[PDB]
Ligand binder design. Structure first.
Ligand SMILES: [Cu+2]
Length: 107
């Protein structure tokens, strides 16, 4: 988790993320099994793509305002932002290989 950015509800000013570059945001909660399963994969991605992609997390129990702004209905939900705007999303767990495929399709 050392290379992951900790986001809060204040990180967004509407549906615009107040951060630059390509940023993959994981919406998650501790009670969510599949969320816990992808956490190590997100750590690997943050390491392998350091300097090219920022990986961030928004805990929906601690920050309950943000998910509704994006119509999020389940977790984990990954939203990929480009220059503050949503460019892609993926609901549900996936493998490391699938996450790299998803990123390649978008970046
Ligand atoms: Cu870490």
């Amino acid at each position: 988790s050392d290379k992951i950015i900790h986001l809060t509800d204040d990180s967004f000013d509407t549906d615009v993320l107040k951060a630059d570059g390509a940023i993959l945001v994981d919406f998650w909660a501790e009670w969510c099994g599949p969320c816990k399963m992808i956490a190590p994969i997100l750590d690997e991605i943050a390491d392998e793509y350091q300097g090219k992609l920022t990986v961030a997390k928004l805990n929906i129990d601690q920050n309950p305002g943000t998910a509704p702004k994006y119509g999020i209905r389940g977790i984990p939900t990954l939203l990929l932002f480009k220059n503050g705007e949503v460019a892609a999303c993926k609901v549900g767990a996936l493998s490391k290989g699938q996450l790299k495929e998803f990123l390649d399709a978008n970046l």
